[PDB]
Amino acid sequence: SLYGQQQAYAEPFIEMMDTNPEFRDKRSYMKNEHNLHDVLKKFGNNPILNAIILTRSNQVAMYCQPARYSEKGLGFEVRLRDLDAEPGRKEKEEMKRIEDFIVNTGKDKDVDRDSFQTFCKKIVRDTYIYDQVNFEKVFNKNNKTKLEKFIAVDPSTIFYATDKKGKIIKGGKRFVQVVDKRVVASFTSRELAMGIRNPRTELSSSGYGLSEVEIAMKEFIAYNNTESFNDRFFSHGGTTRGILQIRSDQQQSQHALENFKREWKSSLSGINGSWQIPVVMADDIKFVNMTPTANDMQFEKWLNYLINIISALYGIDPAEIGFPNRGGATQQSQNKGLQPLLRFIEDLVNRHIISEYGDKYTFQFVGGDTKSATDKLNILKLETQIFKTVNEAREEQGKKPIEGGDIILDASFLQGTAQLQQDKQYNDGKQKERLQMMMSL
Amino acid sequence: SLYGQQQAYAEPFIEMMDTNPEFRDKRSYMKNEHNLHDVLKKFGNNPILNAIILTRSNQVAMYCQPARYSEKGLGFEVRLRDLDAEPGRKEKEEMKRIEDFIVNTGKDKDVDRDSFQTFCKKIVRDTYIYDQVNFEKVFNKNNKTKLEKFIAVDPSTIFYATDKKGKIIKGGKRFVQVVDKRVVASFTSRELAMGIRNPRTELSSSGYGLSEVEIAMKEFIAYNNTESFNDRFFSHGGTTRGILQIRSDQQQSQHALENFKREWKSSLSGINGSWQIPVVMADDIKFVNMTPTANDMQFEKWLNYLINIISALYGIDPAEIGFPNRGGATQQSQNKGLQPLLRFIEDLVNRHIISEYGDKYTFQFVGGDTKSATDKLNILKLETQIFKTVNEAREEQGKKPIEGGDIILDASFLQGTAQLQQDKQYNDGKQKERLQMMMSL
Give the per-residue SS3 of chain B. Answer: CCCCCCCCCCCCCCCCCCCCCCECCCCCCCCCCCCHHHHHHHHCCCHHHHHHHHHHHHHHHCCCCECCCCCCCCEEEEEECCCCCCCCHHHHHHHHHHHHHHHHCECCCCCCCCCHHHHHHHHHHHHHHHCCEEEEEEECCCCCCCEEEEEEECHHHEEEEECCCCCECCCCCCEEEEECCEEEEEECCCCECCECCCCCCCHHHCCCCCCHHHHCHHHHHHHHHHHHHHHHHHHCCCCCCEEEEEECCCCCCHHHHHHHHHHHHHHHCCCCCCCCCCCCCCCEEEEEECCCCCCCCCCHHHHHHHHHHHHHHHCCCHHHHCCCCCCCCCCHHHHHHHHHHHHHHHHHHHHHCHHHHCCCEEEEEECCCCCCHHHHHHHHHHHHHHCCCHHHHHHHCCCCCCCCCCCCCCHHHHHHHHHHHHHHHHHHHHHHHHHHHHHHC
The minimal CB distance from A285 to the residues B245, B292, B309 is found for: B245
CA A350 to chain centre: 17
Query: Over the Cα atoms of chain B, what is R_g?
Result: 38
Confirm if A25 and A34 have CB atoms less than 8 A apart.
yes
Contacts of A421 in chain B (CB under 8 A): 419, 422-423, 426
B85-B87-B88-B93 Cα dihedral, nearest 10 degrees: 160
How far away is chain A from the Cα of B302, in angstroms, using its nearest Cα? 5
- The answer to whether the CB of B9 falls within 8 A of the CB of A184 is yes
Q: How far is CA B216 from CA A316, B313, B438, in A?
A: 20, 8, 102
Q: Do B340 and A62 touch (CB under 8 A)?
A: yes
Binding residue per annotation — A99? no
**Torsion angle in degrees (nearest 10) through CA of A206, A212, A217, A222:** 170
**Residue B392's closest chain A neighbor by CA?**
A399
**Identity of the residue in A44, A297, A320 whose CB atom sits nearest the CB atom of B299:** A297
Which one of A62, A77, A280 makes the best mutation probe of the B interface by having the most chain B beta carbons within 10 Å? Answer: A280
Query: Which element (helix H / strand E) includes A176?
Result: strand A175-179
C-beta of residue A391 within 8 angstroms of C-beta of residue A401: yes
Amino acid at A116: F
How far, in Å, CA of B160 to CA of B178, rounded? 10
Backbone dihedral angles phi then psi of residue B148, each to the nearest 5 degrees: -115, -40
Residues of A in contact with B308 (CB under 8 A): 322-323
CA distance, residue B111 to nearest chain A CA (Å)? 31
For residue A224, the chain B residue with the least C-alpha distance is B218
Most B-contacting residue of A74, A158, A159, A377 (CB-CB within 10 A), to test interface: A377
Q: CA of A103, closest CA in chain B: separation in Å?
A: 11
Inter-chain touch A125–B239, beta carbons under 8 Å: no
The residues facing B152 across adjacent strands are: B135
Query: Of A58, A81, A366, A36, whose CA–CA distance to B342 is shortest?
Result: A58
CB atoms near residue A399 (< 10 Å): 15
- Indicate yes or no: CB of A300 within 8 angstroms of CB of B305: yes
Distance CA A364, CA A348 (A): 11
Give dist(CA B175, CA B183) in Å, integer. Answer: 10
| Cβ–Cβ < 8 Å for A216, A191 | no
**Closest CA in chain A for residue B174:** A112
- CB-based burial, A168-182: b 16+ in 10 Å, e otherwise: bbeeeebbbbbbeee
Decide: B419 and A417 in contact? Cβ < 8 Å.
yes
Q: Measured between alpha carbons, how far is B9 from B31 in angstroms, rounded to an integer?
A: 20
CB atoms near residue A279 (< 10 Å): 14
- B201 C-beta neighbours (distance < 10 Å), count: 23
Alpha-carbon distance values, B399 to B205, B383, B385, B402, B405 (Å): 64, 18, 19, 9, 12
Distance CA(A212)–CA(A304), nearest Å, equals 18
Residues in Cβ contact with A212 at an 8 Å cutoff, skipping those fewer than 6 apart:
A128, A131, A198, A310, A313, A314
Question: CB neighbours of A341 closer than 8 A, spacing ≥ 6?
Answer: A56, A60, A124, A127
Gap between the Cα atoms of A395 and A382, Å rounded: 17
B80 bridge partner residues = B361
Select from A152, A276, A377 the Cβ nearest to the Cβ of B383.
A377
Residue type, A376: K
Strand-by-strand arrangement of the A279-280 sheet:
A279-280, B242-247, B284-289
Beta sheet of B182-187, edge-to-edge order = B158-160, B175-179, B182-187
Smallest CA-to-CA distance from B202 within A376, A267, A129 is with A129
Cα–Cα–Cα angle for B171, B175, B180, nearest 5°? 155
Distance in Å, alpha carbon of B338 to nearest chain A alpha carbon: 10
Instruction: Indicate yes or no: CB of A325 within 8 angstroms of CB of B327.
Output: yes
Q: What share of chain A is helix, strand, coil (3-state, %, to 5)?
A: 45, 15, 40
User: What residue of B is the nearest CA neighbor of A44?
Assistant: B29
A147-153 and A242-247 strand pairing: unpaired
| B88-98 core/surface letters (b: 16 or more CB in 10 A; e: else) | eeeeeebbeeb
CB B108 within 8 A of CB B100: no
Amino acid at A335: N
Per the document, the length of chain A is: 441
Tell me how far the alpha carbon of residue A407 is from its chain's centroid.
51
Q: Under a CB-based contact definition with an 8 Å cutoff, are residues B10 and B1 in contact?
A: yes
The answer to whether A368 touches A72, Cβ cutoff 8 Å, is yes
For residue B328, give the amino acid letter.
G
Main-chain dihedrals φ then ψ at residue A45, nearest 5 degrees: -100, 5
Q: Which of A37, A48, A54, A115 to mutate to test the interface with B (most CBs of B within 10 A)?
A: A54
Residue A393, amino acid: A
Burial A129-140 (b: 16+ CB within 10 A, else e): bbbbbbbbbbee
Contact flag B292-A295 (C-beta cutoff 8 Å): no
Taking the CA atoms of B1, A118, B7 and A154 in sequence, report the sign of the dihedral they define.
negative
Compute the distance between CA of residue B383 and CA of residue A373 in angstroms, rounded to an integer: 10
Is the CB of residue A279 less than 8 Å from the CB of residue B246? yes
Is residue A112 within 8 A of residue B207, CB to CB? The reply is no
Query: Residue B200: which of A125, A227, A421 has the nearest Cβ?
Result: A125
Asked if B305 lies within 8 A of A286 by C-beta distance, the reply is: no
Helices A47-61 and B332-352, packing angle to 10 deg:
70
Query: Would the CB atoms of B347 and A421 count as touching at under 8 Å?
Result: no
Strand partners, B149: B106, B138
Cβ distance A402 to B416 less than 8 Å, yes or no, reads no
Taking CB atoms and an 8 Å cutoff, what residues of chain B touch A390? 408, 413
What is the rounded CA–CA span in Å between residue B352 and residue B192? 9
Q: Per the CB < 8 Å rule, is A58 touching B336? A: yes
Distances (CA, A) of A26 to A14, A154, A167: 17, 15, 15
Note whether B196 and B212 are within 8 A (CB).
Answer: no
- Show me where chain B is broken: residue before each gap, C-N > 2.5 A: 330
B302 with A321: Cβ contact below 8 A? no
CA-to-CA distance for A346 and B53, rounded, in angstroms? 35
Three-state DSSP at A285 gives strand
Return d(Cα B206, Cα B175) in angstroms, integer. 13
Of A285, A403, A409, the CB nearest to B288: A285
Judged by DSSP in three states, A204 sits in: helix
| Residues written for chain B | 441
Bridge-based pairing state of the strands A182-187 and B134-139: unpaired
Distance CA A79, CA A67 (A): 11
Residue B22 vs residues B19, B34, B164: alpha-carbon distances, Å: 9, 15, 7
Name the residue facing B189 among A111, A293, A394 (closest C-beta). A111
A293: closest chain B residue by CA: B292
- Does B340 sit within 8 Å of A58, measured CB to CB? yes
What distance lies between CA A125 and its chain's CA centroid?
8
- Sequence-distant (≥ 6) Cβ neighbours of residue A101 within 8 angstroms: A107
* Distance of alpha carbon B22 from alpha carbon B14, whole angstroms: 16
Contact between A99 and A77 under an 8 Å Cβ cutoff? The reply is yes
What are the chain B neighbours of A50 within 8 Å (beta carbons)?
A: 212, 215, 313
Q: Å from A205 to nearest chain B CA?
A: 24
Whether B4 and A110 lie within 8 Å, measured CB to CB: yes
A297: which chain B residues are within 8 Å (Cβ-Cβ)? Answer: 299, 301-302, 305
Chain A hits for B417, CB-CB cut-off 8 Å, are: 403-404
Nearest to A18 by CA among A245, A178, A127: A178
**DSSP code per residue over A294-314:** S-----HHHHHHHHHHHHHHH
How far off is chain B from A174, nearest CA to CA, in Å?
A: 14
Distance between CA atoms of A321 and A334, rounded to whole angstroms? 12
Rounded CA-CA distance B384/B288 in Å is 90
Contact A27, A36 (CB under 8 A): yes
Q: Specify whether the CB–CB gap between A401 and A418 falls below 8 A.
A: no
**First-to-final CA distance of chain A:** 99
Hey, CA dihedral for B218, B220, B223, B229, is it positive or negative?
negative
Strands B242-247 and A279-280: parallel
Q: Which residue of A has its CA nearest to B434?
A: A432
Question: Which of left, alpha, beta for A181 (phi over 0: left; psi -120 to 50: alpha)?
Answer: left
- Which of A285, A314, A389, A420 to mutate against chain B (most B CBs within 10 Å)? A285
Taking every pair of C-alpha atoms in chain A, what is the biggest distance, in angstroms? 161
What are the beta bridge partners of residue B195?
B133
How far apart, in Å, do the first and last CA atoms of chain B sit?
99
> Mutate which of A281, A296, A301 to test chain B, going by most B C-beta atoms within 10 A?
A281
Contact criterion met (CB < 8 Å) for B385 and A409: yes
Beta carbons within 10 angstroms of residue B113's beta carbon:
15
Nearest chain A residue to B172, by CA: A112
Residue B348's nearest CA partner among B367, B366, B364, B368 is: B364
Q: Contact B199/A121, CB-based, under 8 Å? A: yes
Alpha-carbon dihedral B112, B115, B121, B125, rounded to 10 degrees: 50
Distance from the Cα of A178 to chain B's closest Cα (Å) equals: 10
Shortest distance between the Cα of B313 and any Cα of chain A, in A, equals 5
Nearest CA in chain A to B418: A404
| Chain A / chain B CB contacts < 8 angstroms | 283
